[PDB]
Design a protein around this nucleic acid. Structure first.
Ligand code: 3HE
Ligand code: K
Ligand code: K
Ligand code: K
Ligand code: K
Ligand code: K
Ligand code: K
Ligand code: K
Ligand code: K
Ligand code: K
Ligand code: K
Ligand code: K
Ligand code: K
Ligand code: K
Ligand code: K
Ligand code: K
Ligand code: K
Ligand code: K
Ligand code: K
Ligand code: K
Ligand code: K
Ligand code: MG
Ligand code: MG
Ligand code: MG
Ligand code: MG
Ligand code: MG
Ligand code: MG
Ligand code: MG
Ligand code: MG
Ligand code: MG
Ligand code: MG
Ligand code: MG
Ligand code: MG
Ligand code: MG
Ligand code: MG
Ligand code: MG
Ligand code: MG
Ligand code: MG
Ligand code: MG
Ligand code: MG
Ligand code: MG
Ligand code: MG
Ligand code: MG
Ligand code: MG
Ligand code: MG
Ligand code: ZN
Lengths: 216, 54, 145, 105, 67
RNA sequence: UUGAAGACAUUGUCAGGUGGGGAGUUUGGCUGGGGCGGCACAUCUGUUAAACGAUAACGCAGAUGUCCUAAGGGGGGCUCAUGGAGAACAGAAAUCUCCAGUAGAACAAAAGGGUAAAAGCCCCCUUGAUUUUGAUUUUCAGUGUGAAUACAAACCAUGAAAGUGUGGCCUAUCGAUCCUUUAGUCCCUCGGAAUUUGAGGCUAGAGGUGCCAGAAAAGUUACCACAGGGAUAACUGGCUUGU
RNA sequence: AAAACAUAGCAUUGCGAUGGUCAGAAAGUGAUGUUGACGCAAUGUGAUUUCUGCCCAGUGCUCUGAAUGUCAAAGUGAAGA
RNA sequence: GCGGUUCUGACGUGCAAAUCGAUCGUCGAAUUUGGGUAUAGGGGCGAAAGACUAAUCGAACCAUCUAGUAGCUGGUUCCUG
């Protein structure tokens, strides 16, 4: 690892100091990791795709919607999560608008493993394009746990740009937890690139509206 | 070219020339494969019997 | 990351190969379009001549071998996926279970033109993709029930 | 075959000599050094005229390798190696088998 | 170097001996120099020699002889 | 001397390409001649096999180069194939119930064996698929490899417990020397003396040889050569007489 | 002794001399060459007559064709006592 | 003169390690031939048969390395117990 933990700790401490003391805002600041890529031709190299779960939620209160059968709708209601059945999705006779509005309302979607096949037809490529295509859930899976996972999941996936931005934590989290999550996120990211540490051009940490800190 | 593959013809005659010797028995066979826990104790027991006939 | 380190190429005897099977020629996976066997001389040892079309490039490849010599055959997967989108160059596929593949690249010639015209109106296109030796490509598409 | 990313097993380390939790990874060979004595000797032997001076294996038969696990003890950091049998597919902390489900179309 | 003086680079043996280029004479250019001088003045005795110059094609020596 | 040419080219050394023009060499085995085919070449089940063991043929019917974090380990609860008689839609076949049911089921994969408060089915907990080396059985030279058996010294799992567990109910599912590489001890050595890198050792693994006790290997010859073979084909003769 | 080879005729290829083809261990060395495209060199077909179709995917040969794939030695940069 | 078709003639321990007889091809030129001279062994020379290169050619002859190696063939010397 070209990152020594000490430098990450220093920059995290400076970031937390700035966010708590200098300009405490009326909202919880999310800490992000901005990543640059070197020596990648997106259009010709293989578009890597990796998802990791961070132990503590980087962004609790992320809006999730469940597409479910009657049984999942009832479980979703019990968990206080917005459920849309089918009937519903069907009543929406598309309306680029009606879909667009739904697409932008919730930050992510979780669908039941039966309906999901059906999602592409009932909606359009609208969800696929925003990168909001639903994550699957089983009846034999804990519906709220899955919701805890989605909120806690980070996904590095190269499309066209050598720039990626990923939410690693919040300012209310303990310094050591945040450092561990940054290290885990970078280590996971590097281990998706063909030349490991040589495809990494730059690594920058930031809060939602704070200043930047350059590990690499 | 092809040849004979196998036979035991003549082999018992060869075996009986210098006989089939039964394997020869001793008072005191090897304690080899005997349970180690037993063996370890048995040393200690034999030690004491010497220090007693003295 | 952790992989078994398995071959991607099982050996076969040249005489064992057939028309419309697969075979590796000059480190390229190929489908066999002609297989002929000949005697080499009056001792009558047999020699095989393969003509094979590359499964990705479409290019033609000839090979010669003793009939009993071992040819490397590529392992060839043929998985079907539901088509979600053509994002730009690439396809967006769903893996039956629900997981997504977005790295397949999408076809060039008559297929890729047929696939655009298919997707542009409301049809659910299943899309078969062949994989071989660190390479994938789309080969055919259907409609859903 | 699917094997879990952790494993409680014996640790030979002198501060353990007991079952402890281990992280499980796969073993990867390691880059051959240019100054390993065999490599230095090969280089000398190959120099000059005479062509290829050592055998070059061609008659591959196996289509698998044995998998080796690197188990690292989470206390003391001592490592151990375990060989699995041959297999074509290997995954580490894959999703576990569900019993009694409908095989989808 | 000393190019092996064999017709068309054919050596007629085992591969270790197929070299023609990259072979080198076991005496120095200095020794060749003394020897060729020695033959031109066979009434003399070569005492010693020294380097004076070089270009890409030649080295130049002076050879001290005694009568 | 006169034109051109000029620090280019030429020449020297090294480096990459090209190079049957040329050199050297190789181009398995078994086999009712050889070749083609096959694998009887490393193996496993049943039979041949003559009721200990051994036992041939290109004998017969088949199988092996995998597969499994459970399909391994422990415990619990339960009982299977099939048939009968009943229950809206529901029919030969959906799901529910009772009765009968010695296994006619299942036990990854061939075949054989084994198994019923289980070895089968479902559920709970787990990592004995671990550490240290010895002994033993099969194959056998009583070498190796593979596979397996019973203990010891540890440390664990499970269970109330007795116990059971050192991978898969048992019989197949696999690999030397040299080299590389990893783990271990953080130990020995670098020989004028030190320190630190590097290299070298010791113990245990992996990278593979399927011609499976393990060369690095394409043809042709009617232009042919030599050593031999009636251990072996192409006539006659002989046994046989299917045709 | 032939139906084989040659042959005239036909066609293709290379080359303007700092050259093509070929020789030599090397050379201030040679053949073509006392030569110069109506020539020299390398191939195929085989008098005349008549004709000589289609295929450039393969192998080969060839190209003031794209470039940012692959890519030696030397050189360059960084890390390192 | 040069050649060498057929008799598949003679001969076939010959006149002869290629001859003899008859029959036959060619006979003014891509003719036949003396002498001189050049080309030398992975070399030459070839109107091409792997032909010819001193009775030697799908790689001459001579000497040496060399008593080359042979899992293959042949032989291996007195008597009795
Ligand atoms: C194929 C590769 C090499 C092979 C081995 O080093 C080849 C050697 C064997 C030997 O003793 N002497 C040699 O000269 C060649 C080995 O062990 C494999 C696992 C890995
Ligand atoms: K034989
Ligand atoms: K035999
Ligand atoms: K020689
Ligand atoms: K040499
Ligand atoms: K040698
Ligand atoms: K120059
Ligand atoms: K060269
Ligand atoms: K060549
Ligand atoms: K035969
Ligand atoms: K054994
Ligand atoms: K062998
Ligand atoms: K040959
Ligand atoms: K008859
Ligand atoms: K032509
Ligand atoms: K063509
Ligand atoms: K072409
Ligand atoms: K030659
Ligand atoms: K002579
Ligand atoms: K010779
Ligand atoms: K022999
Ligand atoms: Mg015999
Ligand atoms: Mg046999
Ligand atoms: Mg050197
Ligand atoms: Mg060299
Ligand atoms: Mg050759
Ligand atoms: Mg044979
Ligand atoms: Mg054997
Ligand atoms: Mg018996
Ligand atoms: Mg079991
Ligand atoms: Mg033994
Ligand atoms: Mg075995
Ligand atoms: Mg010293
Ligand atoms: Mg063997
Ligand atoms: Mg006989
Ligand atoms: Mg004649
Ligand atoms: Mg002609
Ligand atoms: Mg004509
Ligand atoms: Mg370089
Ligand atoms: Mg005559
Ligand atoms: Mg006659
Ligand atoms: Mg007579
Ligand atoms: Mg001929
Ligand atoms: Mg002798
Ligand atoms: Mg001799
Ligand atoms: Zn430990």
């Amino acid at each position: 690892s070209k990152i020594t933990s000490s430098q990450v700790r220093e920059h995290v401490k400076e970031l937390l100091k700035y966010s708590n003391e200098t300009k405490k805002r009326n909202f919880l600041e999310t800490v992000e990791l901005q990543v640059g890529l070197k020596n990648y031709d997106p259009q010709r190299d293989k578009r890597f795709s990796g998802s990791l779960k961070l132990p503590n939620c980087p962004r609790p209160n992320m809006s999730i919607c469940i597409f479910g059968d009657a049984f999942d709708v009832d479980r979703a209601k019990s968990c206080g999560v917005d459920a849309m059945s089918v009937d519903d999705l069907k009543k929406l006779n598309k309306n680029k608008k009606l879909i667009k509005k739904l697409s932008k309302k919730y930050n992510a979607f979780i669908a039941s493993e039966v309906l999901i096949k059906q999602v592409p037809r009932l909606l359009g490529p609208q969800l696929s394009k925003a990168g909001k295509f639903p994550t699957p859930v089983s009846h034999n899976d804990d519906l709220y746990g899955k919701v805890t996972d989605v909120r806690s999941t980070i996904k590095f996936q190269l499309k066209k740009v050598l720039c990626l931005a990923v939410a690693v934590g919040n300012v209310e989290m303990e310094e050591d937890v945040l450092v561990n999550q940054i290290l885990m996120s970078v280590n996971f990211f590097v281990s998706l690139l063909k030349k490991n540490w040589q495809n990494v051009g730059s690594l920058v940490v930031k809060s939602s509206m704070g200043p930047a800190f350059r590990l690499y | 070219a092809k040849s004979k593959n196998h036979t035991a013809h003549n082999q018992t005659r060869k075996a009986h020339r210098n006989g089939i010797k039964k394997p020869k028995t001793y008072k005191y066979p090897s304690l080899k494969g005997v349970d180690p826990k037993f063996r370890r104790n048995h040393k200690h027991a034999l030690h004491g019997t010497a220090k007693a006939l003295a | 990351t952790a992989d078994a380190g398995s071959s991607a190429t099982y050996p076969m005897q040249c005489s064992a190969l057939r028309k419309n099977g697969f075979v590796v020629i000059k480190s390229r996976p190929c489908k066999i379009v002609d297989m002929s066997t000949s005697k080499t001389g009056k001792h009558g040892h047999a020699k095989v001549h393969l003509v094979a079309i590359d499964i990705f490039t479409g290019k033609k490849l000839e090979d010669l071998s003793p009939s009993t010599h071992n040819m490397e055959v590529p392992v060839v997967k043929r998985n079907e996926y539901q088509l979600l989108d053509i994002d730009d160059g690439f396809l967006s596929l769903m893996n039956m279970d629900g997981d997504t593949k977005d790295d397949v690249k999408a076809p060039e010639g008559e297929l890729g033109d047929s696939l655009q015209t298919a997707f542009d109106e409301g049809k659910d296109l299943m899309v078969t993709i062949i994989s071989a030796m660190g390479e994938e490509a789309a080969i055919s598409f259907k409609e859903a029930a | 075959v699917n094997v879990p990313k952790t494993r409680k097993t014996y640790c030979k380390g002198k501060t353990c000599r007991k079952h402890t939790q281990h992280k499980v990874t796969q073993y990867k060979a390691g880059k051959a050094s240019l100054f390993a004595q065999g490599k230095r000797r090969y280089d000398r032997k190959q120099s000059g005229f005479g062509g290829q001076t050592k055998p070059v294996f061609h008659k591959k038969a196996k289509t698998t390798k044995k998998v080796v696990l690197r188990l690292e003890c989470v206390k003391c950091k001592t490592r151990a190696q375990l060989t699995l049998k041959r297999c074509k597919h290997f995954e580490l902390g894959g999703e576990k088998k569900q019993k009694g489900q409908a095989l989808q179309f | 170097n000393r190019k092996r003086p064999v017709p068309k680079g054919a050596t007629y043996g085992k591969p270790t001996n197929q070299g023609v280029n990259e072979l080198k004479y076991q005496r120095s250019l200095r020794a060749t120099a003394e020897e060729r001088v020695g033959r031109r003045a066979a009434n003399l005795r070569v005492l010693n020699s020294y380097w004076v110059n070089q270009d890409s094609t030649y080295k130049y020596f002076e050879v001290i002889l005694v009568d």
